[PDB]
Structure formats: C-alpha cells, structure tokens
C-alpha cells in the first residue's frame, strides 16, 4: 500500500512564454544628423570706410 518507483519518464517538456520580433525600421532620430550652421539671408555689410 506504499508508494513505489514507476517507469522512467520517456520525455521532458519545458514551457516558457515568449513574444516575437517586429520589422526593422531603425528610426534613428526625431530631427536627425548634425544639422549644419548656415548663412542668414542677405545679411548686408554693417560697416563702411571713411570718405
């Protein structure tokens, strides 16, 4: 009436919960790159010679 060893298991199942990968879009930056410093339009000379 006691507990005895039974037949060895024939296989093992290991369960884990996993989600999946999306598409590669690689959206690097809101406003991207190093935007260049640049000329103010027209500007004009702010200096003249004497005479």
């Amino acid at each position: 009436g006691g507990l005895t060893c039974a037949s060895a298991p024939q296989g093992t199942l290991r369960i884990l919960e996993g989600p999946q990968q999306s598409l590669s879009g690689s959206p690097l930056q809101p406003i991207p790159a190093s935007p260049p410093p640049q000329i103010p339009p027209g500007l004009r000379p702010r200096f003249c010679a004497f005479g």
Binding site: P37, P40, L43, R46, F47, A49, F50
Partner: protein, 63 residues
C-alpha cells in the same frame, strides 16, 4: 589665457598711439605673437577669431 590653452603673462602695456591701427580706424587691444600656433596647432583660435569678428559685425551669435 584663451579658451584653447594659450596661456601667457602680460609683458607690456603698449601705448595706444604706438599700436598698429587698421584701415578702419580700429586698434587692437591684445597683441598675440603668431609663433604659438606652429608647434601647438591650436587651429581653433584662428577660427574663433573669425567667428567672433563675424558675430560682432552681423550682431549674430555663432556656435
């Protein structure tokens, strides 16, 4: 000193009438010997001079 590691002592206070005046009437207030560039390669000072002169001329502020 400048913002580029070019430190130096003040050796003279040159009279304001003995300074080399420019064709615009101006007269520098700092005289910096041009021989600190060749061995120290602080090309950022030569760009800061032009950037600051352009800023003072156009009323701008460059980065």
């Amino acid at each position: 000193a400048s913002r580029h590691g070019q430190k130096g002592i003040l050796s003279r206070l040159w009279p304001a009438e003995d300074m080399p005046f420019t064709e615009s009437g101006m007269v520098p207030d700092i005289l910096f010997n041009p021989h600190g560039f060749p061995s120290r390669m602080t090309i950022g000072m030569l760009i800061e001079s032009m950037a600051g002169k352009s800023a003072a001329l156009h009323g701008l502020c460059h980065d």
